[PDB]
Amino acid sequence: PTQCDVPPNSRFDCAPDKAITQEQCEARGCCYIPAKQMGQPWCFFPPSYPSYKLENLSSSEMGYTATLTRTTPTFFPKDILTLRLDVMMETENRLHFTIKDPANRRYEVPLETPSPLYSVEFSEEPFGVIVHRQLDGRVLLNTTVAPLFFADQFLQLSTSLPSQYITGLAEHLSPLMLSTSWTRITLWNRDLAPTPGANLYGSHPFYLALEDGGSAHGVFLLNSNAMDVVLQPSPALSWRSTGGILDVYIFLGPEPKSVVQQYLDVVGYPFMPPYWGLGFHLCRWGYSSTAITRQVVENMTRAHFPLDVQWNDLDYMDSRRDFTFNKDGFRDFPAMVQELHQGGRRYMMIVDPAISSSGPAGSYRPYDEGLRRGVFITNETGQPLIGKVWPGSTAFPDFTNPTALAWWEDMVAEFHDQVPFDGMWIDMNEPSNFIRGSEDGCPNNELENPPYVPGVVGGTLQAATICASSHQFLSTHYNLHNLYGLTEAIASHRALVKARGTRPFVISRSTFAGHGRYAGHWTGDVWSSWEQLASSVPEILQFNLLGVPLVGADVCGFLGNTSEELCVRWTQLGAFYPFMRNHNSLLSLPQEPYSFSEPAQQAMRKALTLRYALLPHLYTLFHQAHVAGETVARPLFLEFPKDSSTWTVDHQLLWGEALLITPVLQAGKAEVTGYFPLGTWYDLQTVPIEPREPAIHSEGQWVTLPAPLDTINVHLRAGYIIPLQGPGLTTTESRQQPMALAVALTKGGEARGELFWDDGESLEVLERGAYTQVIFLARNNTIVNELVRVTSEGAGLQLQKVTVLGVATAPQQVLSNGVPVSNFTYSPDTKVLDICVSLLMGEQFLVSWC
Numbered sequence: 092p093t094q095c096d097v098p099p100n101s102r103f104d105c106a107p108d109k110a111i112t113q114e115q116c117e118a119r120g121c122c123y124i125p126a127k128q129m130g131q132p133w134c135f136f137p138p139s140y141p142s143y144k145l146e147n148l149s150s151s152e153m154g155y156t157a158t159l160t161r162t163t164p165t166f167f168p169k170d171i172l173t174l175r176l177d178v179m180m181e182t183e184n185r186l187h188f189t190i191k192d193p194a195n196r197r198y199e200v201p202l203e204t205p206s207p208l209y210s211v212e213f214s215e216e217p218f219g220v221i222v223h224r225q226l227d228g229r230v231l232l233n234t235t236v237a238p239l240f241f242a243d244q245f246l247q248l249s250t251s252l253p254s255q256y257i258t259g260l261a262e263h264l265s266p267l268m269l270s271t272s273w274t275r276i277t278l279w280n281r282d283l284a285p286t287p288g289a290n291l292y293g294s295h296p297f298y299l300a301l302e303d304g305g306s307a308h309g310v311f312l313l314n315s316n317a318m319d320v321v322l323q324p325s326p327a328l329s330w331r332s333t334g335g336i337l338d339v340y341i342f343l344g345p346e347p348k349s350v351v352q353q354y355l356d357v358v359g360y361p362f363m364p365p366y367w368g369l370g371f372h373l374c375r376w377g378y379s380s381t382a383i384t385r386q387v388v389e390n391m392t393r394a395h396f397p398l399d400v401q402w403n404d405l406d407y408m409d410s411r412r413d414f415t416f417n418k419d420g421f422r423d424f425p426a427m428v429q430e431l432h433q434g435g436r437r438y439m440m441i442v443d444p445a446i447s448s449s450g451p452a453g454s455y456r457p458y459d460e461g462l463r464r465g466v467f468i469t470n471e472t473g474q475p476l477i478g479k480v481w482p483g484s485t486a487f488p489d490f491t492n493p494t495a496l497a498w499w500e501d502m503v504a505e506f507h508d509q510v511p512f513d514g515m516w517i518d519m520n521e522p523s524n525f526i527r528g529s530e531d532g533c534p535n536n537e538l539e540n541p542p543y544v545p546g547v548v549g550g551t552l553q554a555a556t557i558c559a560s561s562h563q564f565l566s567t568h569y570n571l572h573n574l575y576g577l578t579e580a581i582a583s584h585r586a587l588v589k590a591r592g593t594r595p596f597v598i599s600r601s602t603f604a605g606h607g608r609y610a611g612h613w614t615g616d617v618w619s620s621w622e623q624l625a626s627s628v629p630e631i632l633q634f635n636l637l638g639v640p641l642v643g644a645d646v647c648g649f650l651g652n653t654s655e656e657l658c659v660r661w662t663q664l665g666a667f668y669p670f671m672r673n674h675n676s677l678l679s680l681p682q683e684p685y686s687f688s689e690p691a692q693q694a695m696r697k698a699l700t701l702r703y704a705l706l707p708h709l710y711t712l713f714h715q716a717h718v719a720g721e722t723v724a725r726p727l728f729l730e731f732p733k734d735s736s737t738w739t740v741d742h743q744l745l746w747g748e749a750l751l752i753t754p755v756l757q758a759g760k761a762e763v764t765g766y767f768p769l770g771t772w773y774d775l776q777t778v779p780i781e782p783r784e785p786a787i788h789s790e791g792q793w794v795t796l797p798a799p800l801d802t803i804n805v806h807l808r809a810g811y812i813i814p815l816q817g818p819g820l821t822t823t824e825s826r827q828q829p830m831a832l833a834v835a836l837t838k839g840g841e842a843r844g845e846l847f848w849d850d851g852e853s854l855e856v857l858e859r860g861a862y863t864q865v866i867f868l869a870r871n872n873t874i875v876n877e878l879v880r881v882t883s884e885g886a887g888l889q890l891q892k893v894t895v896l897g898v899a900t901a902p903q904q905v906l907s908n909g910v911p912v913s914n915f916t917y918s919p920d921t922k923v924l925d926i927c928v929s930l931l932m933g934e935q936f937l938v939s940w941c
């Protein structure tokens with residue numbers, strides 16, 4: 092047929108709900124053409140398939156409103172035949188539209204609200220929204236490409252994509268750039284060890300699409316229901332959600348970093364972590380007493396390994412229950428944590444969401460009080476839904492209930508009164524259930540058995556979690572499931588603020604869009620494998636683009652047994668995770684830095700030492716994330732979008748604009764090949780911290796670098812200045828040391844950098860102005876600071892070393908504030924000028940040479 096002449100790559104599936112025969116396909120009013128070898132749909136929509144018609148388009152002060160009408164039913168039940176379209180032109184960068192049922196309030200995700208670069212026009216029949224980039228006329232969105240479906244439990248909205256390059260749609264084990272070859276991406280939070288093609292712990296319905304020439308846009312669908320996102324190679328995308336409404340934001344960039352910042356303007360800028368949170372964290376399942384746990388710190392200390400935060404897993408609890416500690420191995424738990432604090436370290440422990448429900452009445456306050464106050468998710472007969480997790484039978488708190496929030500704050504404060512822990516590791520908050528749904532199964536209804544089930548592991552919404560039709564304060568679990576973790580992270584953030592009075596530190600397994608405003612994330616139960624080491628790079632980068640910059644993987648891997656070589660390379664790379672924790676499973680061989688051979692220990696110690704030297708810089712990068720929606724770890728394409736060679740690179744990463752990390756990610760290698768964008772890149776090993784080229788002069792090219800077992804390649808971009816600080820086994824110690832600058836000159840002698848400094852943990856620092864901020868500038872053989880703000884926290888900072896890279900000629904003299912310096916060295920082979928000074932970050936200085 093004429094209408095069935097649709098190019099293969101542009102066929103949209105008219106049988107996404109079930110296996111179909113040719114006769115049934117045709118009776119739907121669809122085209123049946125088998126592919127010649129999910130894949131390309133054999134049953135697909137002709138361009139005439141019934142959609143909605145636009146009627147009564149009107150122009151308001153905020154934008155546009157219209158009615159959308161479907162005349163012919165779809166093959167799903169409960170089509171909503173009359174919809175309302177609202178288009179809001181919110182800023183020059185942000186376009187917002189919604190499609191709703193004007194006759195019924197439908198579930199919506201709870202969220203605080205925050206010439207243009209876009210234009211918008213509409214197709215009448217079939218209905219579509221078309222968004223152009225005004226500067227070049229590129230079509231960014233065109234929803235005319237397939238029918239709009241809007242049924243009670245099935246929404247589908249499709250669009251063309253501007254290129255084959257698209258990233259986002261966490262959480263999945265994938266390259267940073269997603270495959271457009273008939274790929275079904277499922278968002279349904281699920282406790283499963285990361286494996287390819289699976290819905291994992293978190294769900295972020297946001298994508299960033301690259302455009303030829305290096306501009307980009309982003310799209311956020313504000314919808315928390317179970318969904319599939321289907322990418323096809325035309326290229327095009329289909330959102331398929333199981334409930335809610337279509338609430339769509341388009342972010343115009345044009346730069347990828349701006350797209351990310353614009354997205355974070357809606358969902359929230361990243362929270363500012365405490366400085367100590369950027370130190371090394373060490374944990375395992377199996378530190379089964381305070382004595383053993385104390386030995387970890389002792390063993391790290393004796394072998395000169397920095398450690399800011401000691402953790403415990405389930406070991407601490409009384410019979411694996413929250414807000415208890417056993418009176419055998421952990422009898423003296425309070426004293427252990429007090430002692431940690433006396434030495435300048437912090438303490439973290441695991442908290443699960445589910446609460447043991449099986450104890451005698453009156454014997455377990457978290458449950459007894461939860462029951463009294465009605466804090467738990469309830470079932471059909473109004474009683475707590477009971478599942479099974481680590482303690483046995485458990486009820487599940489409803490973190491959408493304000494009373495549950497108050498209860499959680501209370502349980503956290505009461506436990507903190509016994510043991511003064513410094514944050515919360517919130518696990519199992521998908522929510523995870525070791526049985527299907529509940530001890531009593533689940534009822535048979537349309538929420539438990541919906542007409543479209545996304546491609547979830549196990550083929551049901553109840554698999555490894557609770558019943559979809561269970562009740563929460565705001566809605567059913569069906570609607571709220573993908574928010575469970577997020578809502579717990581918000582509750583825990585608030586609880587920690589109230590209990591401790593300083594910045595919270597929450598690390599969560601499950602996440603949703605906006606998570607980064609409250610908490611960080613670790614990537615869960617990764618294997619100790621070379622595969623998963625390599626896969627951690629794109630995953631950490633992905634979460635940075637999603638505004639969760641406090642992210643990392645379990646260093647050396649969680650599951651199975653690490654090898655020495657793997658743990659060296661994983662420690663080297665993982666020292667560049669913004670959140671750095673080595674964590675290990677119960678039955679695995681030990682993998683603490685001190686448990687390896689001497690050469691391995693040296694390499695691991697070096698990795699940790701370099702991280703601690705860089706902490707002032709890392710902290711400043713977090714400040715930029717927090718105040719301007721920047722990324723901390725970023726892919727090369729975020730920083731060099733106009734170099735199309737960067738677009739598929741995800742085994743290198745940047746810290747901010749200027750530090751390029753090129754890890755070895757394979758066994759047996761003593762070299763690595765990395766992409767170097769146009770520029771001069773100085774080898775960071777030429778900066779004295781306490782055939783290798785000193786500078787890579789790149790045109791935009793791949794470069795093979797020596798990378799023996801003791802080495803990770805780290806390069807500093809010309810034009811940038813990096814603040815550093817002296818060593819310590821903790822940040823309590825390190826923050827008191829002298830600082831240094833590493834100054835990477837351009838060929839013309841230019842560089843710029845910055846330092847942000849506050850007390851490291853107080854609330855409302857920016858609001859109160861309790862911070863110091865300094866800019867550094869190199870120009871014409873001088874280095875100066877520029878004092879943006881100087882306060883008490885910052886006025887003691889001693890600058891004792893200035894290292895200048897790319898100094899072509901040996902200076903005859905070096906001056907600090909007009910006075911010849913006590914000592915400097917120049918190396919003619921590396922072009923490094925190293926200068927001892929006695930200066931203050933917060934007082935104006937001028938260092939010069941000639």
Ligand SMILES: *[C@@H]1O[C@H](CO)[C@@H](O[C@@H]2O[C@H](CO)[C@@H](O[C@@H]3O[C@H](CO)[C@@H](O)[C@H](O)[C@@H]3O)[C@H](O)[C@H]2NC(C)=O)[C@H](O)[C@H]1NC(C)=O
Pocket residue numbers: 470471472473474475476477531532533
């Ligand atoms: C809603 O959740 C409640 C729990 O909060 C469920 O209560 C459970 O109901 C089952 C029977 O439907 C009870 O099983 C019975 O146990 C007794 C011994 O204790 C035994 O003699 C019976 O033969 C039967 O096995 C179960 O004890 C009870 N759970 C608790 C903790 O009391 C209720 O069934 C749930 N409703 C729905 C519709 O799922």
Ligand SMILES: *[C@@H]1O[C@H](CO[C@H]2O[C@H](C)[C@H](O)[C@H](O)[C@H]2O)[C@@H](O[C@@H]2O[C@H](CO)[C@@H](O)[C@H](O)[C@H]2NC(C)=O)[C@H](O)[C@H]1NC(C)=O
Pocket residue numbers: 146147158160
């Ligand atoms: C598109 O809009 C027209 C006109 O709407 C007008 O009347 C409605 C009831 C409101 O008061 C609105 O503000 C007015 O602009 C709709 O056509 C009208 O529908 C009424 C109810 O069915 C009829 O009684 C009326 O005769 C008719 N008016 C005209 C001029 O045709 C039309 O239904 C609407 N289309 C859709 C799909 O909603």
Ligand SMILES: *[C@@H]1O[C@H](CO)[C@@H](O[C@@H]2O[C@H](CO)[C@@H](O)[C@H](O)[C@H]2NC(C)=O)[C@H](O)[C@H]1NC(C)=O
Pocket residue numbers: 138214216217221230233234235236
């Ligand atoms: C948006 O997508 C639609 C559908 O792919 C495009 O509309 C088609 O345009 C061709 C000519 O290019 C016509 O022959 C068809 O009749 C149109 N189809 C439909 C269903 O209307 C449209 O061109 C796209 N718009 C933009 C601006 O790219």
Ligand SMILES: *[C@@H]1O[C@H](CO)[C@@H](O[C@@H]2O[C@H](CO)[C@@H](O)[C@H](O)[C@H]2NC(C)=O)[C@H](O)[C@H]1NC(C)=O
Pocket residue numbers: 383384386387390683
């Ligand atoms: C801390 O280090 C000590 C010393 O290396 C470890 O103690 C040894 O443990 C092994 C068991 O694996 C014994 O064979 C040795 O005899 C022990 N030596 C001493 C001197 O006690 C200890 O296991 C380490 N603890 C932790 C928690 O890592």
Ligand SMILES: *[C@@H]1O[C@H](CO[C@H]2O[C@H](C)[C@H](O)[C@H](O)[C@H]2O)[C@@H](O)[C@H](O)[C@H]1NC(C)=O
Pocket residue numbers: 651652678679680
């Ligand atoms: C992780 O290791 C433990 C213990 O392994 C023991 O035997 C092997 C062969 C080595 O020699 C170790 O040094 C020794 O301690 C195993 O019991 C466990 O199965 C293993 N895990 C996996 C996934 O293989």
Ligand SMILES: *[C@@H]1O[C@H](CO)[C@@H](O)[C@H](O)[C@H]1NC(C)=O
Pocket residue numbers: 871
């Ligand atoms: C660099 O400084 C010297 C004075 O110390 C001056 O002669 C020269 O013009 C300066 N260069 C520029 C570009 O300002």
Ligand SMILES: OC[C@H]1O[C@@H](O)[C@H](O)[C@@H](O)[C@@H]1O
Pocket residue numbers: 106109110111112130131132133134
């Ligand atoms: O995707 C291809 C599949 O489509 C289904 O709807 C058909 O029933 C199958 O025969 C076919 O293999």
Ligand SMILES: OC[C@H]1O[C@H](O)[C@H](O)[C@@H](O)[C@@H]1O
Pocket residue numbers: 376404405441518600615616649674675676
């Ligand atoms: O608490 C026991 C285990 O629970 C989950 O599997 C966590 O992902 C893991 O890190 C932890 O060790």
